[PDB]
Design an enzyme around this catalytic site. Structure first.
Site, mmCIF file in Angstrom:
data_model
loop_
_atom_site.group_PDB
_atom_site.id
_atom_site.type_symbol
_atom_site.label_atom_id
_atom_site.label_comp_id
_atom_site.label_asym_id
_atom_site.label_seq_id
_atom_site.Cartn_x
_atom_site.Cartn_y
_atom_site.Cartn_z
ATOM 1 N N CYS B 404 0.814 -1.219 0.000
ATOM 2 C CA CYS B 404 0.000 0.000 0.000
ATOM 3 C C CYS B 404 0.857 1.283 0.000
ATOM 4 O O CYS B 404 1.496 1.547 -1.016
ATOM 5 C CB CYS B 404 -1.077 -0.096 1.078
ATOM 6 S SG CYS B 404 -2.133 1.355 0.894
ATOM 7 N N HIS B 525 -3.425 -4.700 -0.238
ATOM 8 C CA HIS B 525 -2.877 -5.281 0.969
ATOM 9 C C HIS B 525 -2.762 -6.796 0.801
ATOM 10 O O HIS B 525 -3.780 -7.488 0.847
ATOM 11 C CB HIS B 525 -3.829 -4.958 2.125
ATOM 12 C CG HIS B 525 -3.485 -3.702 2.858
ATOM 13 N ND1 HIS B 525 -2.485 -3.587 3.785
ATOM 14 C CD2 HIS B 525 -4.109 -2.494 2.783
ATOM 15 C CE1 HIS B 525 -2.522 -2.355 4.290
ATOM 16 N NE2 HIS B 525 -3.490 -1.640 3.697
ATOM 17 N N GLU B 527 -1.568 -8.858 2.955
ATOM 18 C CA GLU B 527 -1.550 -9.524 4.254
ATOM 19 C C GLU B 527 -2.803 -10.353 4.478
ATOM 20 O O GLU B 527 -2.707 -11.504 4.909
ATOM 21 C CB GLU B 527 -1.473 -8.542 5.423
ATOM 22 C CG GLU B 527 -0.374 -7.500 5.376
ATOM 23 C CD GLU B 527 -0.821 -6.204 4.704
ATOM 24 O OE1 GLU B 527 -0.774 -5.134 5.344
ATOM 25 O OE2 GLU B 527 -1.234 -6.247 3.531
#
Ligand SMILES: Nc1ccn([C@@H]2O[C@H](COP(=O)(O)OP(=O)(O)OP(=O)(O)O)[C@@H](O)[C@H]2O)c(=O)n1
Ligand SMILES: Nc1ccn([C@@H]2O[C@H](COP(=O)(O)OP(=O)(O)OP(=O)(O)O)[C@@H](O)[C@H]2O)c(=O)n1
Ligand SMILES: Nc1ccn([C@@H]2O[C@H](COP(=O)(O)OP(=O)(O)OP(=O)(O)O)[C@@H](O)[C@H]2O)c(=O)n1
Ligand SMILES: Nc1ccn([C@@H]2O[C@H](COP(=O)(O)OP(=O)(O)OP(=O)(O)O)[C@@H](O)[C@H]2O)c(=O)n1
Ligand SMILES: Nc1ccn([C@@H]2O[C@H](COP(=O)(O)OP(=O)(O)OP(=O)(O)O)[C@@H](O)[C@H]2O)c(=O)n1
Ligand SMILES: Nc1ccn([C@@H]2O[C@H](COP(=O)(O)OP(=O)(O)OP(=O)(O)O)[C@@H](O)[C@H]2O)c(=O)n1
Ligand SMILES: [Mg+2]
Ligand SMILES: [Mg+2]
Ligand SMILES: [Mg+2]
Ligand SMILES: [Mg+2]
Ligand SMILES: [Mg+2]
Ligand SMILES: [Mg+2]
Lengths: 559, 559, 559, 186
Positions: B404, B525, B527
């Site tokens: 990001c 993102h 994650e």
């Protein structure tokens, strides 16, 4: 073994004792050998220390164990004989384990009240429920435990813990909890929040309830039951209502209309208990005796008025066993009962100097009575009124029963008014005068079930006809003072004949007066042995004589 | 349908979220289509209003629903995709029923919180547990409910009532309660009274517990379990201990040694749920993937050091998803992880004027790192440190991932230090200057799972090899500001090639720098989409490049 | 309460006693407080009247009750202590109810053997199974009843009727029947018709079988089991095979491979019995002690040869408890046992005048032995051989234990051969000679568990090290004749030191000889108190000394 | 030797009393500690190796009994010092005051028929019960600090007033037992 624990309450005056004495009765109609245990949170070892003014009469067991009233309610509803161990108390169990400490049996450990004392409770309930109680030495199938106090107290606390462990130390499906509860009515609305604030505490103290037995003033609304079954986890069929009905002998049949046998048969798997046809058919026959005697109460109209003559008549619980025995005798005669409370001291002529209204109302009630009872009083301060009622009952021919003190005032009356010794006295009262005409003597206590033998010539005695003419009678006693046996040969000559005596011959236990319709003294207590289907023979005699048809009762007995 | 509710606690910091995320994992090894629900007692509608300082990172779902951390733990343990409805909150359900009042749907009744709002909870849990969550639209077999707060609170209160009704509105044997609890150790003795004072409250609020999952500092003594099984009604086999072990990925296998599948298979009758061999064999294969990856953790020794470069590194929960994705990538590479916390503002040369120790420790940690991560920060105040770490990672050849904000500082770094515009700026920060060299523009929010398409020439890109060379990537986004697309034709000429873009072509979403071992920006993102058996491809790329053997990982993917 | 009755047989020699002693052992691995009852159809009141020639040794209980062998097998397998009531016999129950008739307790009814005597059996089994048997006074969870004789006899007849009623007077699911049965093999074919002709009689006499425990010479064929499960109504998983394996201590683990705990856990609902972790973990630990000691038997190779020196060695059952205690001591030392049967009269030199082969074989076996045992014989006619073996054991340094008569011949040997009185004599034999050197005296019987106190200086005694140095020993006795206490002050001076005595000091109960590797007399019987996981300390001493490593055993005890 | 309970460790407590007498190390016997000190001294200085705790080896009925039962004796009781006691370090620690008030527990006490032997061998009974018949303190002549007390000196100690026999022990073991005897008597 199976247990049903009757428990709970927002308030302690709520009347659990009928739901206990009436749940056990319903289970006895399945033919099960039912027993019962009372838990009383008070510190008294046993009731012998606490006077009949202080929460009602001093009961007696076969052991001589002076005990809580609530034993009596199970004995008379269930037909059972109890023992002084069936009354668990905070006094008893703490006196037991603390005496066991000085004996050393915890091997010098700490005797914490968790683990060890709650283990003594769980041991005591398992001992006691295996003691036999019926006419044969067979051990009980089901035990009803009445938890005195309330669940959510500080005198209750070891019992509710002990019973949380006992829900497992005896398996679930061998244990069930019935929670009695309060549902107040205010401005016309049924309020189930006192109940929902005792279901919270019940779950917290760790038992789980099965029934929710409300003592509402009304029938519970279908919406009231639906909300109690939303906040307690019971299904709505199980929220029994225990409202007032025409006499307390109907209460079992209300619980039977409310499915409570069908629920307890399921919830304790009572079909898996071994029963004979001699058990089961006695069960279903006893149900029809209860349906018959309640049907007889529903349309019996012909009154019989019995004067109960004694001190403290404003404390009616001081005579609870006397009242209940007259109710059994009443329903067996099929006459509806009125009891006339004669506060005995008002019959004494000195009352005319204090209040004439008391003197007239008391003699009016006594004169109106179809039969008269001197009900085994306590102390001495009303005795002259009890003598005047015995004079009246002898001379006016009215049916009479003297229980305990009642036999003794009858001997004092007969001495003063037929033998002609006006100074003759209760040695129970007028002691340090040391006079020669003593109608009584101290012989330091005598308690429990004892054998009374009939004296040889006794065949004509109505009391011996009422006992089935059997040569020996087994009944429960209390007396320090007994008739002075050196007057008996005079009374035996004057027509006051001692129908029954102790096995040594030296102690006098029953008399009947010759040539009167029914005039009896019994120095044992006939109240305590009466059962709801077997009224005590002297009390069945009194309520029969007062109803008329004393002869027809003597056939119903001897056939 | 079946439910397991994970609940309880003497204290709220006790760590229920592993026992939830780990009970559901054990049930997924039976092959069951498991789902999960978080209850959070806070008043927030959804987490988007509360900053990452205040109880950890701002999660993202496929919906764009900015949500509680604890959704993420179930997604990564269970492989499931959740929706913003799976986060029940006091904010949501009260905003729901109070908005429903102004809509009128209770027909102008009272909307008491008993009956009606607890009915909305019981409806919401029954809606949500039927939403599909796996790779096919099949509805869940079992739902794990994590009850946030504690049982015995005032923010918990409607949920514990709703769940008492829900124990019946869904039948027992379709519901089970797991009570997490505290057993303190003091002076060497295990203290089970905090636990026994939350079993009292549990029974009171009306749920009944099944498991007693203690968070003791130790193995529970056999006598400690025996007493917890005396005061709670569970059998001693059910008093699970959840003590610390070498990583949280072992916790399911401790619960499996402690019989918890064998108990839940019985207590919910999970043999009666219909399963195919495609369910069951996926179940028992996933168990062997968990036994394999935990065995690989038990003897992996060769370290890899990853520098995580950003603000607020003392608040590690502000990056919980970043940390957890590196742990998955680590265990897949079979290198043991160390993460180097670089508080980015310390890399800025002005820190040398304030404290030299901070300036050296931070550059020391950055220089020591085998790989570097710019972890999608928030705000702007550390940005110059994140630019210096990107300069270092480009020139010193060290492996790099920008997430990001990380992609955006990489474009700012490359503009200032390769294209040669030293005034070029984050338009996210230096806005009202109105300068021409803007590396970013605002394009008012963009959230949730979005489609990223690879640009045509991309075949050589290591990031495209890690995504299996598939033409489109589905991953979760958050960004107000995006790269100014009018610089892209310059970067595309200078070897900073935009491997991936939005479906309109106008927005830039991935870059890889030509001629470096591994240097990637991703503006989504990566994650949040990582699972414990499927590490997120850019993060698997980083931990592979830093371990060496990036080529061998590219075979493990593409075979 | 629960019952498992072990029963049946086409033939009475079939070996039910292992399946009883081994079913109860498997149930003790669930942690249940197991007990056992033997039924013996013989008319003996108790075994004290019947000589060890006639169906084996005369056992002893804590009560002094001289009893059937089969009590001993349960005591040593189950760790339990039994009482003389646990041996039901036709002698006992008929002597009981016929003595009860002359007492009058049937109220002058007929005492038919149906109804009334079968009711006394059902009462006796319900009394006896509630007597405590473990180290604490807790009443048993499960009772194993071994029905002696066969189902289908005339000595069995009241027991099989009593047990038909007892299948209901205790509910089904609190009772299970295991039928042992014969499946002969002839010309290579398994013959299940003797079994099918005892399932017909079983159903007829009215019990219904659960297990069909065949004593075939082989593994049962899958087709043999399928036909037994067609003619008996059991499912084929329940047709257990009890074939021979390397020692009888393996038999429980064969029944555990054959699902018998998993079946009995279901068929008696043993999950509903209340157990603590102190019960359950003792259960699963005892299982691992049984798995360990059977694994130790499976690969122990190093032999130890113990000479058992006495009369009637062809009747090995005359010593069954002696043999079994050496097997426990063997497996605890991890040496494999050979026992050398020395028919003691053959050691006497006059045998050389009758048959030299007997004189050489017996002295050969005695000389070959690694340790020597004089095993508490009966009568006197072999005594000179037992004296010569005691001379040999003292002078040749070989390890020695004298039990009962063994202590007494050791004193006679020591008197004749160390003190130098060659005319000194067993007063048990050479009585009416009236000689002065009497090594013994009559003191009319002494039986049961008695307290032995160690004499003060005893610290050095290997026997006191084997008893853990504890000051008092509780062990089972039988002796009419005891050492003449007027010789003790001489023996105490000559190094024959009386380590232990009766609480009055006047009676001598243990000696150990100074300056020998291990030479012990015990005048109690150490055999009977040995358990399969707790070998009797003097016998563990003997088999340790004979194995070597007596010191290493003394650490295993005292740690 | 800290006033134990039961008897099963007694031989170890005798060996530590032998060690403390012969190796000169400072010693305090409390309750059972005084009694094992008499048993030690009987076995190892008076030379009766069969001498015994009558508290343990009872039904042997042997003549060398170091103790006798005299059924309980509890609470604060008066201990009077025997006349010659002036030299005794224990009497210096009690401020030389003629009577000591301290708390007791013992069923078994030293057999008073051995005392005239111990009094001759340098084991001197510094303090006795008011009847003279019961022995309550001893100090051994010619050792730096070796004391038995048959009362329990533990219970009467206060945080600002340590129990005199225990102040004696920790002083002797620290050195400067003489300097403590000034701090008391000034
Ligand atoms: N089968 C019953 C049971 C009770 N009573 C009446 O109930 C009384 C006392 O109330 P009870 O129901 O026994 O309970 P409480 O006294 O209220 O006490 P608790 O609620 O603590 O059990 C007595 O007056 C008795 O006449 C009765 O008549 N018949
Ligand atoms: N355990 C409960 C029960 C009720 N209420 C709330 O309290 C309000 C008032 O209680 P009430 O309506 O009177 O409920 P009841 O339980 O019927 O109280 P009562 O039986 O006294 O009428 C209800 O509308 C409901 O919203 C509550 O908070 N907790
Ligand atoms: N499978 C899991 C579960 C939790 N955590 C860690 O647990 C944390 C927070 O504690 P958690 O167990 O989620 O519960 P609490 O925050 O204590 O909250 P609550 O007890 O109210 O559920 C985070 O630091 C996270 O790293 C983890 O690493 N792995
Ligand atoms: N619910 C309970 C539990 C215990 N006790 C009593 O309180 C005493 C002290 O409590 P403790 O022994 O500490 O019990 P635990 O429950 O173990 O407390 P903790 O776990 O903190 O040690 C116990 O001996 C017991 O008599 C009690 O009154 N109520
Ligand atoms: N656990 C066992 C059980 C029995 N036996 C052996 O079995 C013997 C006698 O047979 P048993 O099995 O006890 O039964 P039977 O004597 O055949 O009698 P019944 O069948 O009537 O019960 C003894 O030799 C004994 O050594 C054994 O060694 N171990
Ligand atoms: N209860 C039975 C069993 C068998 N048969 C018949 O008898 C024949 C011979 O018996 P057999 O085949 O030997 O049956 P088994 O029961 O196996 O006999 P065994 O076990 O001795 O071999 C069978 O073919 C069958 O037709 C019978 O009449 N009644
Ligand atoms: Mg009140
Ligand atoms: Mg009452
Ligand atoms: Mg907090
Ligand atoms: Mg959490
Ligand atoms: Mg035979
Ligand atoms: Mg046998």
């Amino acid at each position: 073994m199976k247990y049903v624990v009757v428990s709970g309450g927002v308030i302690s005056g709520i009347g659990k004792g009928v739901l206990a004495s009436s749940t056990g009765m319903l289970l006895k109609t399945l033919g099960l050998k039912v027993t019962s245990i009372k838990i009383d949170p008070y510190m008294n070892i046993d009731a012998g220390t606490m006077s009949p003014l202080e929460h009602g009469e001093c009961f007696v067991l076969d052991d001589g164990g002076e005990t809580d009233l609530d034993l009596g309610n199970y004995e008379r509803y269930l037909g059972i004989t109890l023992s002084r161990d069936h009354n668990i108390t905070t006094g008893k169990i703490y006196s037991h384990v603390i005496s066991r400490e000085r004996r050393g049996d915890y091997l010098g450990k700490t005797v914490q009240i968790v683990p060890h004392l709650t283990n003594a409770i769980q041991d005591w309930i398992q001992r006691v429920s295996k003691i036999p109680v019926d006419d044969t030495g067979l051990e009980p199938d089901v035990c009803i435990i009445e938890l005195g106090g309330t669940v959510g107290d500080i005198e209750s606390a070891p019992f509710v813990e002990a019973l949380r462990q006992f829900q497992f130390e005896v398996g679930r499906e061998n244990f069930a909890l019935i929670h009695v509860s309060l549902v107040p009515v205010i401005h016309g609305e049924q309020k189930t929040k006192p109940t929902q604030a005792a279901i919270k505490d019940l779950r917290s103290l760790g038992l789980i309830p099965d029934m929710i037995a409300c003592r509402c003033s009304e029938e519970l609304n279908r919406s009231t039951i639906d909300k109690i079954a939303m906040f307690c986890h019971v299904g709505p069929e199980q929220v029994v209502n225990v409202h007032d009905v025409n006499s307390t002998y109907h209460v079992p049949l209300l619980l039977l209309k409310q499915h409570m046998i069908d629920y307890l048969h399921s919830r304790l798997k009572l079909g898996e208990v071994p029963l004979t046809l001699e058990d089961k058919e006695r069960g279903s026959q006893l149900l029809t005796n209860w349906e018959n005697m309640t049907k007889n109460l529903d349309d019996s109209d012909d009154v019989v008025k019995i004067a109960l003559v004694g001190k403290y008549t404003n404390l009616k619980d001081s005579y609870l066993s006397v009242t209940k025995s007259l109710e059994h005798a009443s329903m067996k005669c099929r006459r509806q009962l009125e009891i006339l409370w004669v506060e005995a001291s008002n019959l004494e002529p000195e009352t005319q100097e204090v209040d004439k209204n008391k003197f007239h109302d008391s003699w009016n009630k006594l004169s109106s009575a179809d039969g008269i009872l001197v009900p085994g009083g306590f102390g001495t301060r009303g005795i002259e009124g009890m003598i005047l009622a015995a004079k009246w009952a002898r001379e006016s021919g009215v049916p009479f029963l003297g229980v305990c003190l009642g036999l003794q005032v009858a001997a004092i009356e007969f001495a003063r008014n037929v033998i002609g010794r006006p100074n003759s006295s209760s040695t129970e009262f007028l002691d340090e005068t040391l006079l020669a005409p003593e109608d009584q003597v101290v012989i330091t206590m005598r308690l429990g079930l004892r054998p009374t033998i009939f004296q040889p010539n006794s065949e004509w005695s109505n009391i011996r006809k009422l006992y089935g003419e059997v040569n020996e009678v087994h009944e429960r006693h209390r007396h320090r003072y007994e008739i002075n046996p050196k007057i008996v040969n005079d009374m035996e000559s004057r027509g006051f004949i001692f129908v029954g005596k102790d096995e040594t011959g030296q102690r006098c236990e029953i008399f009947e007066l010759k040539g009167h319709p029914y005039y009896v003294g019994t120095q044992y207590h006939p109240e305590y042995t009466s059962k709801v289907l077997e009224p005590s023979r002297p009390f069945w005699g009194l309520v029969a004589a007062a109803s008329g048809t004393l002869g027809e009762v003597i056939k119903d007995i001897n056939l």
